């Protein structure tokens, strides 16, 4: 009676209490103090209220399961519809509205039609923080902001991940490739699954480009989910000396203006020899030139370095595969890899000429 | 897109259950037919507290102020502080944080700053001794409300450090198919910026009402001296009844004001407590909301808790209607099979809740 009254939701709650016989106010409703005084002058109404480990865990969970059964043994449309509903092995029809045309048009019964129920978390989007790994049999290394198709829960979706490292647990700063044989972190805009769920990732899902190699590229688990990530990409500012004394030097071009040097005063720099230093004051007439002080006398063949950190953003890109809405259901094509784009529009790969290593030979070091 | 509610009732419970469930809601007609219509300042600052606690949740107040749009986000916690207004004490803002408190990335270390007590709200001793043990046996183990200083109304000036530091996955399934035997009955009588004899007058009034029941009565006494007393005179009394074999508790509090006799207030809170014992069964009339909220966000099992006839009310069933309105779950009230009293046993099958914000 009372449950039907509670969940019959076209009648007022005081009408439920009336035909059975507001929460900003925290403390509940009491009588008048005089009525309560004459009511509780007596006391006798409430005087009777006053006065192995593995098998143990399995026993606790089977105790909960028998509690589940013996409390399910109740009203038939209560159990079998609304208090739990359709346990397992129930044969159901399930109707979806606004299913696309292409499914019904191109429905080929070879390809299975699987459906899975999303949790409250898995309908949310945002940055998923994983730790992943180039799969040991995938040949080529992976690159940040190259798409790969993830299989994260029920969904398969192509995303743009960016591989990070917490370099001795200080930053979470941005790599440019995945490592060769171990795990890195990663962050991709996608549907937020729960933490500790595993996933695969694939470069190429089609069959025209299926090649001869191994097709699954990345493996990993999900570490954390969030709405925002704060990851950084190191930028150094390089400048050269042009007037050197003992223990101090005038540094030429890492800044364009004395306002910029004023913005950066007191910062610690270093040469490539590891000589630590500090910038002290902007010089007046040559504009980006400043005066720095070092540990000792630096040389004219050095480069000073201001290690700073620039924030980088994940790219909010997400397309699910929708392979069953195609006329071929293989041959799904998404965003291409960067080498594929360069091969398509014939751009040469970017080569900084002074980034290439050489064979340095030391001259012998003699002093006066 | 939005689950729609009407009126400014149960406002904190609606925003709290929307944050738990992750469902976008609208609350329409916030006192629209009124002389100063719209949201009030204390519930606007509660929205600011929700934006402090969560991250990525967008709240969208209208022009007229009479409808709010809450699209929730991830509970992240962190350390914060909240300078809540004089319209409501710190209990009005620390009560709805005890639901969101164990389900965040980083542990709750917030300190609220304002009035400590009110007639129609939760106190420090209320929050602590009543509402922390039901969480303590629903699954959390490290939760603490500290008073650094307390401020009686109207000027207040008291700070309260809510720290929860057990980030559980989900609350356990409750099984309370008994009425817990009350082992002791204790309490705390506090007074700030007044004479220390008022506390003993309150204690003597409460215990002369309590003296005829054959249990053991113990009321602790604190006067607050110095900067810890706050900016205003005040005094109040909070009794709990303590079932020690399981840990259950039933509380009742109030505060005195300008013209109030302390023996009168002590005996009033004592009789109000005994009536809560009468109208209580394994919970209190005010511990019952978050008890059944933790039962409904437990595991995907059946959890059952005994309640009595008089705990059913318009507040309790409007709570149940809001629960079913947000995440589509029903309670099943089965009666006990013995007939010297009218007690139901509410079985709730909890939704499949986990906290997905805590990093693994």
């Amino acid at each position: 009676n009372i449950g039907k009254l509670i969940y019959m939701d076209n009648i007022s709650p005081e009408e439920c209490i009336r035909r059975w016989r507001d929460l900003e106010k925290f403390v509940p409703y009491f009588d008048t103090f005089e009525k309560l005084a004459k009511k509780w002058k007596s006391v006798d109404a409430i005087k009777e209220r006053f006065l192995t480990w593995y098998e143990l865990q399995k026993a606790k969970i089977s105790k909960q399961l028998e509690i589940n059964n013996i409390e399910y043994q109740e009203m038939t449309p209560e159990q079998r519809q609304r208090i739990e509903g359709f346990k397992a092995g129930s044969y159901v029809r399930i109707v979806f509205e606004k299913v696309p045309m292409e499914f019904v048009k191109n429905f080929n019964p070879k390809f299975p039609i699987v459906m899975g129920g999303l949790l409250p978390t898995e309908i949310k989007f945002g940055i998923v923080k994983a730790r992943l790994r180039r799969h040991r049999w995938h040949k080529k290394i992976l690159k940040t902001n190259d798409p790969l198709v993830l299989s994260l829960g029920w969904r398969r979706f192509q995303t743009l991940p960016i591989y990070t490292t917490t370099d001795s647990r200080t930053r979470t700063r941005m790599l440019k490739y995945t490592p060769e044989h171990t795990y890195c972190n990663a962050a991709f805009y996608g549907p937020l699954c729960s933490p500790n769920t595993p996933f695969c990732g694939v470069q190429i899902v089609a069959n025209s480009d299926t090649g001869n190699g191994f097709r699954i590229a990345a493996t990993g688990i999900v570490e954390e989910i969030d709405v925002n990530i704060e990851i950084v990409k190191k930028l150094k500012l390089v400048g050269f000396p042009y007037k050197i004394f003992k223990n101090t030097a005038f540094i030429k071009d890492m800044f364009s203006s004395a306002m910029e040097v004023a913005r950066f005063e007191g910062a610690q720099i270093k040469t490539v020899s590891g000589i630590r230093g500090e910038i002290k004051r902007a010089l007046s007439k040559p504009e980006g030139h400043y005066r720095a002080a070092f540990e000792d006398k630096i040389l004219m063949s050095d480069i000073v370095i201001l290690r700073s950190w620039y924030p980088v953003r994940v790219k909010k890109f997400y397309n699910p595969v929708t392979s069953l809405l195609l006329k071929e259901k293989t041959e799904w094509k998404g965003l291409r890899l960067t080498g594929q784009i360069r091969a398509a529009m014939n751009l040469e790969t970017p080569s900084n000429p002074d980034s290439a290593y050489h064979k340095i030979e030391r001259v012998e070091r003699h002093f006066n | 897109k939005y689950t729609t509610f009407q009126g400014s009732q149960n406002f904190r419970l609606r925003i709290v259950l929307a944050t738990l469930s992750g469902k976008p809601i609208k609350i329409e007609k916030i006192r629209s037919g009124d002389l100063n219509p719209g949201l009030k300042d204390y519930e606007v600052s509660f929205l600011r507290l929700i934006e402090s606690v969560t991250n990525g949740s967008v709240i969208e107040i209208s022009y007229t102020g009479t409808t709010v749009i809450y699209r929730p986000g991830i509970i992240v916690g962190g350390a914060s502080t909240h300078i809540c207004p004089s319209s409501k004490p710190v209990g009005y803002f620390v009560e709805p944080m005890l639901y969101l408190a164990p389900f965040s990335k980083k542990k709750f270390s917030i300190l609220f700053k304002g009035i400590t007590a009110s007639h129609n709200d939760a106190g420090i001793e209320a929050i602590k001794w009543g509402l922390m043990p039901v969480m303590e046996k629903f699954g959390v183990r490290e939760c603490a409300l500290h008073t650094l200083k307390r401020g009686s109304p109207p000027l207040g000036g008291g700070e309260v450090h809510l720290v929860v530091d057990s980030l559980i996955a989900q609350p356990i399934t409750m099984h309370e198919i008994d009425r817990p035997i009350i082992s002791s009955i204790t309490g705390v009588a506090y007074s700030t910026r007044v004479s220390p004899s008022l506390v003993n007058r309150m204690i003597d009034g409460a215990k002369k009402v309590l003296k005829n029941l054959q249990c053991e009565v113990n009321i602790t006494a604190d006067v607050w001296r110095g900067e810890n007393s706050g900016k205003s005179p005040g005094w109040g009394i909070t009794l709990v009844a303590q079932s020690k074999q399981k840990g259950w508790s039933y509380f009742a509090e109030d505060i005195g004001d300008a013209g109030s006799i302390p023996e009168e207030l002590g005996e009033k809170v004592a009789c109000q407590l005994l009536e809560e014992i009468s109208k209580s069964a394994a919970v209190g009339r005010n511990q019952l909301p978050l008890a059944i909220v933790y039962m409904v966000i437990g595991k995907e099992d059946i959890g059952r808790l005994r309640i009595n006839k008089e705990q059913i009310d318009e507040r309790f069933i409007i709570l149940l209607r809001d629960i079913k309105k947000i995440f589509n779950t029903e309670v099943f009230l089965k009666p006990v099979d013995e007939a010297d009293n009218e007690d139901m046993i509410a079985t709730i099958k909890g939704i499949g809740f986990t906290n997905t914000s805590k990093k693994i």
């Binding site: - | 991250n55 967008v58 969208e60 107040i61």
Partner: peptide, 14 residues
């Protein structure tokens, strides 16, 4: 420092 890693905000149109 309070703004630095937020993503929400109340939208007070009053």
């Amino acid at each position: 420092k309070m703004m630095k890693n937020k993503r929400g905000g109340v939208i007070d149109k009053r």
